[PDB]
């Protein structure tokens with residue numbers, strides 16, 4: 001293992017990207033403003049806030065964020081980049097070794113299901129397979145601390161409500177989460193020498209919804225920004241983002257749960273970071289510089 005951890009390495013999608021796609025896009029997407037400095041929200045994302053809670057003075061020197069907006073598990077224009085390629089990018093730059101002193105974080109899958117693909121069960125199968133494959137690869141290359149996050153109920157996104165896909169998006173979310181729990185249970189039993197951490201985003205997001213006003217949200221179905229999506233634009237998270245009309249963004253968004261048709265606002269990312277930190281503290285995870 002590794003008693004105190006010295007950094008966080010995150011693999012994920014637009015829920016975790018801290019500006020990687022924005023840089024490659026020459027700052028043209030996500031347009032900022034109204035997005036915040038290339039994050040897919042109007043403030044820093046959860047994993048940045050988590051890193052700063054442990055390393056308040058120089059959090060970015062303790063966070064290696066390989067998440068790109070539009071990333072998912074391969075199942076090809078649907079996906080900007082794959083989990084496998086994010087992991088292999090980390091490995092390439094680290095001499096094919098996963099540091100035993102890093103907290104590896106995997107939050108992926110939402111981009112696959114929100115593309116509303118036509119093959120339901122094959123998509124579920126291949127997302128689960130791709131996550132298991134990347135976990136096994138990290139373990140094989142020396143990882144000793146792995147945090148896996150499941151999905152919120154994607155049927156709650158404004159996208160699902162507007163497009164009439166609530167049932168399908170909730171089904172993907174629930175089936176994905178059930179399979180992912182089985183995967184994590186398998187790895188826990190097989191690799192007791194690795195620290196396995198799990199965050200039940202599904203239950204936490206439902207709790208936020210059920211108590212939305214108490215968490216600070218006055219609107220859970222609308223969007224701070226405004227997008228106009230066609231039929232061939234409904235096909236992907238990145239198309240929805242590109243279709244934001246910046247001049248029509250609301251000026252006062254402190255009460256919205258959703259910044260755009262799928263992405264949560266800054267306050268939701270803050271809540272997520274706070275709950276993740278409490279989970280890690282309960283588990284006894286310790287960081288140090």
Ligand SMILES: CCCCCCCCCCCCCCCC(=O)O
Pocket residue numbers: 013014015070109110111112114152154157201204205208237262263264268269271272273275276
């Ligand atoms: C522990 C805090 C509970 C609240 C969780 C906050 C996260 C909100 C989730 C909204 C749906 C996100 C879908 C984004 C699209 C994608 O990642 O491809």
